[PDB]
Design an enzyme around this catalytic site. Structure first.
Site, short mmCIF file in Angstrom:
data_model
loop_
_atom_site.label_atom_id
_atom_site.label_comp_id
_atom_site.label_asym_id
_atom_site.label_seq_id
_atom_site.Cartn_x
_atom_site.Cartn_y
_atom_site.Cartn_z
N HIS A 94 -59.01 86.62 -9.32
CA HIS A 94 -58.89 86.46 -10.75
C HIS A 94 -60.12 85.73 -11.23
CE1 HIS A 94 -56.97 85.89 -14.62
NE2 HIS A 94 -57.50 84.68 -14.60
N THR A 125 -63.22 79.15 -2.99
CA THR A 125 -61.89 78.99 -2.42
C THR A 125 -61.34 77.68 -2.91
OG1 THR A 125 -62.76 77.95 -0.36
CG2 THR A 125 -62.35 80.32 -0.34
N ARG A 174 -55.44 88.92 9.54
CA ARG A 174 -56.17 88.84 10.80
C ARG A 174 -56.45 87.40 11.19
NH1 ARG A 174 -61.30 87.08 9.84
NH2 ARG A 174 -62.11 87.25 7.69
N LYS A 192 -71.36 78.89 -3.54
CA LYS A 192 -72.77 78.73 -3.17
C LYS A 192 -73.36 79.65 -2.09
CE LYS A 192 -76.10 74.97 -3.35
NZ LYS A 192 -76.78 73.96 -2.48
N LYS A 240 -62.61 84.35 12.47
CA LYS A 240 -63.60 84.83 13.42
C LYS A 240 -64.95 84.21 13.20
CE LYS A 240 -61.83 89.46 13.01
NZ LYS A 240 -62.11 90.76 12.34
N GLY A 297 -64.38 70.86 -1.30
CA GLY A 297 -64.59 71.37 0.05
C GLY A 297 -66.04 71.07 0.44
N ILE A 300 -58.48 83.23 -5.14
CA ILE A 300 -57.65 84.00 -6.05
C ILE A 300 -58.41 85.16 -6.63
CG2 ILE A 300 -56.05 83.83 -7.97
CD1 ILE A 300 -56.36 80.76 -7.71
N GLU A 348 -57.67 77.17 2.46
CA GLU A 348 -58.49 77.60 1.32
C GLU A 348 -58.01 78.92 0.71
OE1 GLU A 348 -62.64 77.17 2.32
OE2 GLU A 348 -62.14 76.23 4.24
N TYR A 406 -60.48 71.92 -10.31
CA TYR A 406 -60.35 70.79 -9.40
C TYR A 406 -59.33 69.82 -9.99
CZ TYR A 406 -64.47 72.26 -6.79
OH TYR A 406 -65.37 72.96 -6.03
C1 FMN Z 1 -59.92 85.55 2.97
C2 FMN Z 1 -60.86 84.57 3.68
C3 FMN Z 1 -61.25 84.85 5.00
C4 FMN Z 1 -62.02 83.94 5.73
N1 FMN Z 1 -62.39 84.22 7.00
C5 FMN Z 1 -63.17 83.37 7.72
C6 FMN Z 1 -63.54 83.70 9.03
O1 FMN Z 1 -63.10 84.71 9.56
N2 FMN Z 1 -64.40 82.82 9.76
C7 FMN Z 1 -64.87 81.63 9.17
O2 FMN Z 1 -65.65 80.91 9.76
N3 FMN Z 1 -64.47 81.30 7.87
C8 FMN Z 1 -63.62 82.16 7.16
N4 FMN Z 1 -63.21 81.82 5.86
C9 FMN Z 1 -63.44 80.43 5.36
C10 FMN Z 1 -64.80 80.28 4.71
O3 FMN Z 1 -65.78 80.14 5.74
C11 FMN Z 1 -64.82 79.06 3.78
O4 FMN Z 1 -63.80 79.23 2.79
C12 FMN Z 1 -66.18 78.90 3.08
O5 FMN Z 1 -67.16 78.47 4.03
C13 FMN Z 1 -66.12 77.90 1.92
O6 FMN Z 1 -65.74 76.58 2.36
P1 FMN Z 1 -65.49 75.42 1.25
O7 FMN Z 1 -64.39 75.81 0.37
O8 FMN Z 1 -65.40 74.11 1.95
O9 FMN Z 1 -66.86 75.44 0.39
C14 FMN Z 1 -62.41 82.72 5.12
C15 FMN Z 1 -62.03 82.42 3.79
C16 FMN Z 1 -61.26 83.34 3.06
C17 FMN Z 1 -60.91 83.03 1.74
N1 ADP Z 2 -60.90 82.64 -8.14
C1 ADP Z 2 -61.04 81.41 -7.67
N2 ADP Z 2 -60.44 81.05 -6.51
C2 ADP Z 2 -60.57 79.81 -6.03
N3 ADP Z 2 -61.29 78.88 -6.68
C3 ADP Z 2 -61.91 79.18 -7.84
C4 ADP Z 2 -61.79 80.46 -8.37
N4 ADP Z 2 -62.49 80.49 -9.49
C5 ADP Z 2 -63.03 79.29 -9.67
N5 ADP Z 2 -62.68 78.48 -8.67
C6 ADP Z 2 -63.14 77.08 -8.51
O1 ADP Z 2 -64.01 77.04 -7.36
C7 ADP Z 2 -63.55 76.01 -6.45
C8 ADP Z 2 -63.86 76.34 -5.00
O2 ADP Z 2 -65.23 76.72 -4.88
P1 ADP Z 2 -66.04 76.49 -3.53
O3 ADP Z 2 -67.42 77.00 -3.66
O4 ADP Z 2 -65.24 76.93 -2.37
O5 ADP Z 2 -66.17 74.89 -3.58
P2 ADP Z 2 -65.33 73.92 -2.61
O6 ADP Z 2 -66.05 73.84 -1.31
O7 ADP Z 2 -65.51 72.52 -3.36
O8 ADP Z 2 -63.89 74.26 -2.62
C9 ADP Z 2 -62.08 75.83 -6.74
O9 ADP Z 2 -61.72 74.47 -6.49
C10 ADP Z 2 -61.98 76.12 -8.23
O10 ADP Z 2 -62.20 74.92 -8.98
MG MG Z 3 -63.40 75.86 -1.36
#
Ligand code: FMN
Ligand code: ADP
Ligand code: MG
Length: 149
Positions: free
Chosen positions: A85, A28, A105, A22, A108, A16, A83, A80, A92
């Protein structure tokens, strides 16, 4: 109208923006664009709760976001899953098995990273509770997941 969840699907876990862990302390697992764009139309953008398993692992609770992340303003819609856990290593490349079972919801925008983290944290708790409804726990036994292993 297809709010006839649960909705099941599998996706390869890909990179992602590197923001979850970070910036938010909440990783996610992200699906490939092909999985997102092939989602049923009736599935609205927003935040859901549900079940998930990595590979042939156990099924755990999770929350999943489906949308454009208003805070970061992404161009491409994403899916995204976070989990609830603790894993020892990143997964990956593994296949994430998912069952979206309920809507929490919509996506936002927020005034700060703090507000967003807090909202997400809020979804996790609400999710933790609702997934306990027996009707939902059964989902965790669905054949879809028995085949995962
Ligand atoms: C349960 C949950 C709720 C989220 N809600 C929002 C939200 O309301 N607004 C938003 O901009 N991003 C939301 N996000 C997305 C996150 O902004 C995004 O997963 C995060 O920036 C990481 O992005 P990446 O996996 O590319 O690193 C949500 C993610 C999760 C898991
Ligand atoms: N509980 C978890 N839920 C989702 N991803 C997890 C979890 N624990 C470890 N990870 C690892 O973290 C990664 C996502 O982290 P994130 O910071 O969102 O990076 P990215 O932007 O590359 O997805 C997943 O691909 C997985 O490899
Ligand atoms: Mg992610």
């Amino acid at each position: 109208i297809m709010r006839h969840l649960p909705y099941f699907c599998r996706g390869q876990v890909v990179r992602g923006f590197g923001r979850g862990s970070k910036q938010l302390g909440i990783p996610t697992a992200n699906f490939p664009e092909q999985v997102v764009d092939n989602l049923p139309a009736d599935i609205s953008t927003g935040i859901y709760y549900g079940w998930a398993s990595v590979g042939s692992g156990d099924v755990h609770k999770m929350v999943v976001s489906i949308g454009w992340n208003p805070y970061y303003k992404n161009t491409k819609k994403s899916m995204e899953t976070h989990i609830m856990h603790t894993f020892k290593e990143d997964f990956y490349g593994e296949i994430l098995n998912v069952a979206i079972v309920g809507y929490l919801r919509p996506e936002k925008n927020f005034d700060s990273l703090e507000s967003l983290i807090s909202a997400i944290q809020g979804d996790i708790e609400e999710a933790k509770k609702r997934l306990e409804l027996p009707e939902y726990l059964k989902i965790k036994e669905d054949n879809f997941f028995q085949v995962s292993k």
